[PDB]
């Protein structure tokens, strides 16, 4: 539950889902990670230690990750109509900005 | 608590953001969207009653709250850097999304 292991929780079950080959590997990476991005909001990274609960920063923090718990819900919906490999490419997409993330508050 | 309230008060709240003259207003209104906003999508929406909650109309209804959560946490964000004609914007681009979602799932 600190920011870091639910960070390497996301970067994880990336890799898994690329390497998933049905269907209930997939959704369980995604549930992983849908849990690992609402705990991470919880969390506190380095760079908001020293930051104010409504500053802007923690403000934008929120925003990083509830953007990302909405995509990561949105793979689930893929994956959950049938569609597990539109699923892993919503999911691959989120690299990026999961790597983004990790850096800009590390 | 239940879904028609909240997205009662998401499209009252839009109007007293449109017509705020100061930043408490702006930032007090997305408070209370943001808050409608988590509480209706731990909600069932009429439309999905007779759905499983993890189905996928079920998580495309979660992704769209998630989605419009992340999107006031960037008002938010942006009215605490006291940019508020700025927060006041972003505001006005969830009417969109706020009526698109209550339409869908109404």
Same mark, same amino acid.
């Given at each position: 539950?600190d920011?870091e292991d639910n960070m390497?929780?996301? @970067?994880?079950?990336?890799?898994?889902?690329?390497?998933?080959? @049905?269907?209930?590997?997939v959704? +369980?990476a995604?549930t992983?990670?849908?849990?690992?991005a609402?705990?991470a909001?919880?969390?506190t990274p380095?760079?908001?230690? &020293?930051?104010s609960? &409504?500053?802007?920063?923690?403000?934008?923090?929120?925003?990083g990750? +509830?953007?990302?718990?909405?995509?990561?819900?949105d793979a689930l919906?893929l994956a @959950?109509?049938?569609?597990?490999?539109?699923?892993?490419?919503a999911?691959?997409?989120?690299?990026?900005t999961?790597?983004?993330?990790?850096?800009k508050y590390?």
């Amino acid at each position: 539950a600190d920011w870091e292991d639910n960070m390497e929780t996301l @970067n994880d079950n990336l890799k898994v889902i690329e390497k998933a080959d @049905n269907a209930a590997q997939v959704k +369980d990476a995604l549930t992983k990670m849908r849990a690992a991005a609402l705990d991470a909001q919880k969390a506190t990274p380095p760079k908001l230690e &020293d930051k104010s609960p &409504d500053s802007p920063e923690m403000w934008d923090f929120r925003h990083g990750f +509830d953007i990302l718990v909405g995509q990561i819900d949105d793979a689930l919906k893929l994956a @959950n109509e049938g569609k597990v490999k539109e699923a892993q490419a919503a999911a691959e997409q989120l690299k990026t900005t999961v790597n983004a993330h990790w850096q800009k508050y590390r």
